[PDB]
Design a protein around this ligand. Structure first.
Ligand SMILES: OC[C@@H]1O[C@@H](OC[C@@H]2O[C@@H](OC[C@@H]3O[C@@H](O)[C@H](O)[C@H]3O)[C@H](O)[C@H]2O)[C@H](O)[C@H]1O
Ligand SMILES: OC[C@@H]1O[C@@H](OC[C@@H]2O[C@@H](OC[C@@H]3O[C@@H](O)[C@H](O)[C@H]3O)[C@H](O)[C@H]2O)[C@H](O)[C@H]1O
Ligand SMILES: [Ca+2]
Ligand SMILES: [Mg+2]
Length: 315
């Protein structure tokens, strides 16, 4: 995938027995040479680094304090934790989207930061604050958090996002600004079709002729009480209609459950999917039942059946 490049790595041959600094919530990954990076929810957007993809060390943050403009959109925010970053690489620039919000409310904005490199030893390393991408207010029926960027088969970039309210949103981006095209409409593409509309964290990939919409269902953010699960559906057109493996509309609670966790890893969710050739990984967090529900980075190989549906080997 041109905008999530991994090189010549065979994700299926790696031994993903992760070690080190694994606290993470809503993680995404990028690779640049021998170095791998995780961006995740935390103070100023938290960053980890790894020499190999398996052993992780904390590497600080994107911003020392909240960008000043954020306060205009979310004036009640009184801490610097930024949520659910998403990274892609395009025209020689890293585009890093992130969410400014407060829990349980839809007064929110997605911001964009850019860099020419992810290696802070590189003299060109500098995260530039590129301001707001798209917002939500209390009068809107959507929530401007949980961004993902995907490029469609025609090379057009798209932003999915959303969490509760009417569900998952989709909008076309301008290639020059990497923010919503002035003549683009907001489309709702997935919903539980019930209240609470517990669907969030979209991530869309294109694989072998379909767009796959990965989402998280049910309740994050409750430690060992979480009920998060990862679900997927697909469509031949990026604008839908997305359906699950059984044929259920993702606008009516459709979604094939890929993982609902186990006795140790509770509430897996807020996922990302990356490719290296035909090989693939699923990246997500899960709440560690041993270690007091602390959200933990997971990276697992993701297989694809002969009907094109993804699956994990542990199920
Ligand atoms: O999960 C992320 C964080 O919580 C998410 O939602 C907070 C939720 O508030 C309720 O949503 C109410 C919605 O208004 C209706 O139109 C819509 O259909 C309802 O679902 C949920 O029970 C809380 O988790 C936020 O998105 C973010 O804070
Ligand atoms: O239970 C443990 C969880 O740790 C905290 O981590 C940071 C939290 O993430 C924010 O919400 C981000 C939303 O959840 C994502 O999976 C949803 O898709 C993102 O938008 C929380 O509000 C921050 O506190 C969790 O809160 C905490 O519950
Ligand atoms: Ca995400
Ligand atoms: Mg082997």
């Amino acid at each position: 995938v041109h905008f999530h490049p991994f090189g010549n790595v065979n994700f299926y041959e790696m031994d993903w027995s992760l070690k080190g600094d694994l606290w993470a919530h809503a993680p995404v990954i990028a690779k640049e040479g021998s170095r791998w990076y995780v961006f995740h929810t935390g103070s100023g957007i938290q960053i980890k680094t790894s020499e190999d993809g398996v052993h992780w060390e904390n590497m600080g943050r994107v911003f020392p304090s909240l960008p000043d403009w954020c306060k205009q959109y979310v004036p009640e925010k009184d801490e610097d934790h930024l949520w659910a970053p998403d990274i892609c690489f395009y025209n020689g620039i890293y585009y890093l989207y992130y969410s400014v919000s407060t829990f349980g409310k839809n007064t929110s904005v997605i911001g964009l930061a850019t860099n020419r490199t992810l290696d802070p030893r590189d003299p060109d390393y500098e995260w530039k604050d590129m301001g707001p991408v798209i917002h939500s207010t209390a009068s809107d029926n959507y929530n401007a958090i949980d961004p993902n960027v995907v490029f469609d088969q025609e090379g057009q970039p798209w932003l999915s996002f959303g969490s509760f309210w009417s569900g998952i949103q989709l909008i076309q981006l301008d290639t020059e600004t990497m923010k919503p095209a002035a003549q683009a409409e907001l489309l709702t593409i997935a919903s539980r079709g019930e209240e609470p509309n517990a669907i969030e964290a979209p991530f869309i990939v294109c694989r072998n002729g379909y767009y796959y919409l990965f989402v998280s269902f049910d309740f994050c953010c409750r430690g060992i009480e979480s009920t998060y699960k990862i679900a997927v559906g697909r469509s031949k057109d990026i604008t839908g209609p997305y359906v699950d493996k059984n044929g259920v509309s993702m606008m009516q609670g459709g979604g094939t459950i890929l993982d609902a966790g186990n006795d140790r890893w509770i509430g897996p969710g807020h996922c990302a999917v990356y490719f290296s050739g035909v090989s693939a990984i699923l990246v997500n967090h899960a709440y560690d039942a041993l270690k007091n529900g602390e959200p933990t980075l997971q990276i697992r190989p993701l297989y694809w059946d002969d009907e094109g549906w993804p699956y994990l080997l542990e199920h």
